[PDB]
Design an enzyme around this catalytic site. Structure first.
Site, PDB file in Angstrom:
ATOM      1  NE  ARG A 224      -3.403  -1.878   3.058  1.00 16.95           N
ATOM      2  CZ  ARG A 224      -4.722  -2.008   3.101  1.00 16.95           C
ATOM      3  NH1 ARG A 224      -5.610  -1.023   2.929  1.00 16.95           N
ATOM      4  NH2 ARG A 224      -5.133  -3.259   3.357  1.00 16.95           N
TER       5      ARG A 224
ATOM      6  CB  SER B  24       7.310  -6.261   6.746  1.00 19.43           C
ATOM      7  OG  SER B  24       6.762  -6.969   5.632  1.00 19.43           O
TER       8      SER B  24
ATOM      9  CG  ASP C 219       5.624  -5.983   9.493  1.00 23.28           C
ATOM     10  OD1 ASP C 219       4.713  -6.716   8.995  1.00 23.28           O
ATOM     11  OD2 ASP C 219       6.800  -6.262   9.882  1.00 23.28           O
TER      12      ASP C 219
END
Ligand SMILES: Nc1ncnc2c1ncn2[C@@H]1O[C@H](COP(=O)(O)OP(=O)(O)O)[C@@H](O)[C@H]1O
Ligand SMILES: Nc1ncnc2c1ncn2[C@@H]1O[C@H](COP(=O)(O)OP(=O)(O)O)[C@@H](O)[C@H]1O
Ligand SMILES: OC[C@H]1O[C@H](O)[C@H](O)[C@@H](O)[C@@H]1O
Ligand SMILES: OC[C@H]1O[C@H](O)[C@H](O)[C@@H](O)[C@@H]1O
Length: 898
Positions: free
Chosen positions: A524, A588, A642
């Protein structure tokens, strides 16, 4: 004509009509329904007990078995071989063991010691003590059974009355007596009522056999019911034999208009007064005595023997059902009457003989008529279940009375067929006894017990005891220490990576930021607006972009160009123009950072494999891809894991949030460590958020004692074999494959799907863990677990689905306990490190498996609470994703430039 006519008048109420029989039949139809109902069962006199025998034999039975047979007129032990050799369905050998009244009326222990002894003697004599022959037990008393190998005695009936047995599982008592012997081992795999044995014995010969009937010492019937009508057994699938225990019909007082003084007398002096009332009008234990009571009253009225009454005549039990049978014989009955009555002490006349014979006729015919009525009800019930105009069925029968009385079976059949004119009924005598039937049940029970044993042994490898979990906890702590220390950091498998985030949100952050979220399920691009002051606000917008696997596994230049293309799009989508904005990159994967805005990729994890990335600064990679596009400019202020973003998102509101946890595609955790413990970073002041990269726990073999053959398989077929071992036992990308590999093994062993490895079961990825959450919270039809398994491509049975749901559960439960043990290490380190007695700490959490699984989060919180009791841990699910936290990180980053 006179005598018999008068006898008819005297015993008029014992001589039932068809109208009365139809009435009785209808009352019995109603009690069967009460018996089966979940609402009336507790107060139903006709118990309709589930037997767990779901079919008559199908021909696949084969083996060499031992069958015990207790409760009837003789205690028998048999060895029954079935299709053990070609052209010999069955072969049987038997022994009757004398079991005197003191054993039957004494203590339970004494009873079961007697059974164990005779079983020992039986095996001894035949030298079969080492053959391991599965044992079947025909135990003809009402039992509560939840499975084929349990039999909780509800109530003694007939001649038995041994203390300490009612309310106990007779399998356990029998096991206990055998153990006490110490002489031999016996595997009792099945208990069955004698009605059920009879039905199975006859079913082996006739495939239309649906009823088992006993008319012996006691009387009872079993029949095949539809699962949908058996409220106390889960499932609506198929059929199951029901033991009616019809002897207790009328125990509530519903047959009081049929019962006579004689019935009341025999009941009052029996071993069980007020129980088994129907049976007391019908069976062999009682008919002779009913006759004797009638002859005594008649004698007293001077209707027999000119009023002569001897003490022998007055002796309870002195005139048995065999005497009734002898007396009713066609040619020799009167003669037998004469001899029998002569022995009573009377001097019976010839007329006395005729009268007595008629009393025997009325008593034995009433019995036959009564059993016809109740059987008729069962036949009508079968006819309704089948849904046809006519009923074709076979009733298997056994019992001394039915087998030896010269007239009974004939009269019973006649009346039965008259009362149920819509049925074509065959009566098949069970000439081999219950044992053959028991053996057929035993064969099936044994096969299933062997399958369950193997399934359990496989699944037991995934069970983790508390002590084991405490040891995982201890090992995680140990690896945390190794990664934080300078000396040992380089060869530590849990890297304990500095994030360069030194504090949680202080409430002053504000600005407009861009952020990227790469590495989880969705890539995203976000726009986050934070405003502090009177009423703080956060406003977020995002767009998901797909990253095809070819770009995830292509070149670093291609991957970053793709990321930059999506940023370009999002800027247009949001109408963002003006000076270059600050951006926080949530990436991540493990990175070695030298500062907030620098992060060298240490290795790829999960499904990424782009080339020329490992060993590069990913901010530099991003910066390069922005320059190649030569359109917008960006101020990359931070590269964030993350876990760390998640923690910051949760700590925006909670001052106790000092831990971040991800349980999605991969699993990892982060937590605020004291600078004095972060030896790889210069400075001993304040704290620093540490990105554990706990996924790699076990990469040095430290969890080899708990990894199973299925874990090994998943790793060996993975993109990074040998790496991220702990993660592979916990996260979303991997649990499905653990399950799939277990299912394949069970299918090859023939425990699932008919032994058929469907090309889609052989296809990796098909057990998405999307469907892992779905299967783990079902229906009762498990009709849910069916569409899941069929859509993909196999074809379950309800037995199948169940197994699949159990496997899923074992895997997800272990995953959540493992995850818990690691989390228990992190919070106890925080506690212990701050010198506190208790620690109240919040963990910000995220990830799709964590969010969607029905039991993961619960099981995992429970584990944490058990393993670190002095920590009180609150797990708060992020609503917003890592974004609010990456923006907060970015704000401080900007701020820290000044
Ligand atoms: N409903 C009944 N209940 C009790 N006894 C009955 C009943 N109907 C007939 N009997 C008696 O049964 C006998 C008739 O037997 P049945 O089987 O029909 O012929 P058979 O003499 O060949 O046995 C007579 O002794 C008669 O009084
Ligand atoms: N119903 C489900 N139950 C459990 N895990 C699931 C379910 N659906 C999806 N998952 C797992 O969730 C994972 C993705 O979560 P995550 O890494 O946080 O990605 P994202 O939030 O960006 O979508 C996948 O590994 C997927 O297999
Ligand atoms: O042996 C015949 C029948 O006797 C009794 O009535 C028992 O309650 C029943 O368990 C059995 O089936
Ligand atoms: O996305 C969750 C986790 O997946 C893997 O374990 C990655 O190494 C880790 O960096 C990330 O936190």
């Amino acid at each position: 004509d006179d005598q018999v006519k008068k006898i008819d008048k005297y015993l008029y109420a014992m001589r039932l009509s068809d109208e009365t029989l139809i009435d009785i039949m209808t009352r019995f139809r109603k009690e069967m329904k009460n018996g089966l109902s979940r609402d009336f069962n507790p107060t139903a006199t006709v118990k309709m007990l589930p037997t767990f025998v779901r079919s008559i034999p199908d021909g696949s039975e084969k083996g060499d078995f031992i069958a015990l047979d207790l409760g009837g007129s003789s205690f028998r032990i048999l060895r029954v071989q079935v299709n053990h050799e070609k052209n010999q369905n069955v072969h049987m050998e038997s022994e009757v063991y004398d079991t005197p009244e003191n054993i039957v009326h004494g203590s339970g222990s004494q009873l079961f010691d007697h059974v164990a002894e005779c079983l020992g003697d039986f095996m001894e004599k035949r030298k079969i003590k080492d053959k391991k022959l599965p044992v079947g037990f025909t135990f003809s008393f009402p039992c509560q059974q939840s499975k084929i190998d349990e039999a909780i005695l509800i109530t003694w009936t007939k001649r038995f009355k041994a203390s300490g047995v009612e309310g106990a599982d007779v399998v356990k008592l029998l096991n206990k007596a055998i153990k006490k012997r110490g002489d031999y081992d016996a595997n009792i795999v099945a208990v069955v009522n004698d009605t059920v044995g009879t039905m199975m014995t006859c079913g082996y010969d006739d495939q239309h056999c649906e009823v088992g009937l006993i008319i012996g010492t006691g009387t009872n019937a079993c029949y095949m019911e539809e699962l949908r009508h058996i409220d106390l057994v889960e499932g609506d699938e198929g059929r199951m034999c029901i033991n009616t225990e019809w002897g207790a019909f009328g125990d509530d007082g519903s047959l009081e208009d049929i019962r006579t003084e004689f019935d009341r007398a025999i009941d009052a002096y029996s071993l069980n007064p007020g129980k088994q009332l129907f049976e007391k009008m019908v069976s062999g234990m009682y008919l002779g005595e009913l006759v004797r009571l009638i002859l005594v009253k008649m004698a007293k009225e001077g209707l027999l023997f000119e009023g002569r009454i001897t003490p022998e005549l007055l002796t309870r039990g002195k005139f048995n059902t065999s005497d009734v049978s002898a007396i009713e014989k066609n040619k020799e009955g009167l003669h037998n009457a004469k001899e029998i009555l002569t022995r009573l002490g009377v001097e019976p006349s010839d007329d006395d003989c005729v009268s007595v014979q008629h009393v025997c006729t009325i008593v034995s015919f009433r019995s036959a008529n009564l059993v016809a009525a109740t059987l008729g009800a069962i036949l009508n019930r079968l006819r309704d279940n089948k849904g046809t105009p006519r009923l074709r069925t076979t009733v298997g029968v056994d019992g001394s009375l039915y087998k030896t009385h010269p007239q009974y079976s004939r009269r019973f059949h006649k009346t039965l067929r008259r009362l149920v004119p819509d049925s074509d009924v065959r009566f098949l005598l069970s000439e081999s006894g219950s044992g053959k039937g028991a053996a057929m049940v035993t064969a099936v029970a044994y096969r299933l017990a062997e399958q369950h044993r193997q399934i359990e042994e496989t699944l037991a490898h995934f069970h983790l005891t508390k002590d084991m979990l405490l040891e995982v906890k201890k090992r995680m702590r140990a690896e945390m220490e190794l990664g934080l220390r300078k000396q040992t950091h380089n060869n530590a498998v849990v890297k304990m990576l500095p994030s360069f985030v030194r504090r949680t949100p202080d409430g002053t952050e504000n600005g407009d930021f861009l952020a990227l979220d790469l590495g989880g399920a969705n890539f995203r691009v976000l726009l986050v607006k934070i405003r502090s002051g009177k009423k703080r606000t956060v406003e977020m917008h995002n767009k998901i972009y797909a990253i095809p696997i070819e770009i995830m596994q292509g070149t670093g230049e291609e991957l970053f160009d793709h990321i930059v293309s999506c940023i370009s799009d999002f800027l247009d989508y949001m109408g963002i123009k003006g000076p270059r904005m600050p951006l926080g990159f949530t990436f991540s994967f493990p990175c070695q950072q030298t500062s907030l805005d620098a992060g060298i990729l240490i290795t790829w994890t999960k499904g990424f494999k782009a080339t020329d990335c490992v060993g590069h600064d990913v901010v530099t990679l991003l910066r390069d891809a922005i320059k190649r596009r030569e359109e917008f400019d960006l101020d990359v202020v931070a590269v964030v894991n993350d876990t760390v973003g998640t923690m910051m998102t949760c700590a925006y509101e909670e001052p106790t949030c000092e831990v971040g946890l991800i349980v999605g595609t991969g699993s990892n955790a982060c937590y605020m460590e004291e600078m004095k413990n972060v030896e790889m970073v210069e400075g001993d002041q304040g704290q620093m958020c540490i990105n554990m990269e706990w996924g790699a726990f076990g990469d040095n073999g430290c969890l080899d004692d708990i990894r199973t053959h299925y874990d090994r398989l998943v790793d060996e077929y993975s993109l990074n074999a040998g790496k991220q071992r702990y993660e592979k036992m916990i996260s979303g990308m991997y649990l499905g494959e653990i399950v799939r590999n277990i299912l394949i093994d069970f299918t090859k062993k023939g425990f699932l799907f008919r032994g058929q490895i469907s090309e889609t079961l052989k296809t990796r990825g098909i057990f998405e863990t999307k469907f892992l959450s779905q299967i783990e919270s079902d229906r009762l039809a498990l009709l849910q677990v069916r569409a899941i398994l069929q859509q993909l491509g196999l074809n379950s049975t309800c037995d199948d689905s169940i197994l699949v749901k159990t496997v899923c559960g074992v895997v997800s439960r272990r995953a959540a306990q493992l995850c818990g043990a690691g989390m228990a290490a992190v919070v106890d380190k925080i506690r212990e490190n701050r010198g506190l007695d208790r620690l109240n700490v919040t963990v910000g959490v995220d990830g799709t498996l964590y969010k969607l699984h029905p039991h993961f989060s619960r099981i995992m919180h429970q584990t944490v609470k058990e393993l670190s009791p002095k920590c009180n841990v609150s797990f708060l699910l992020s609503e917003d994703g890592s974004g609010k936290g990456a923006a907060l990180i970015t704000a401080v980053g900007v701020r820290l430039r000044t």
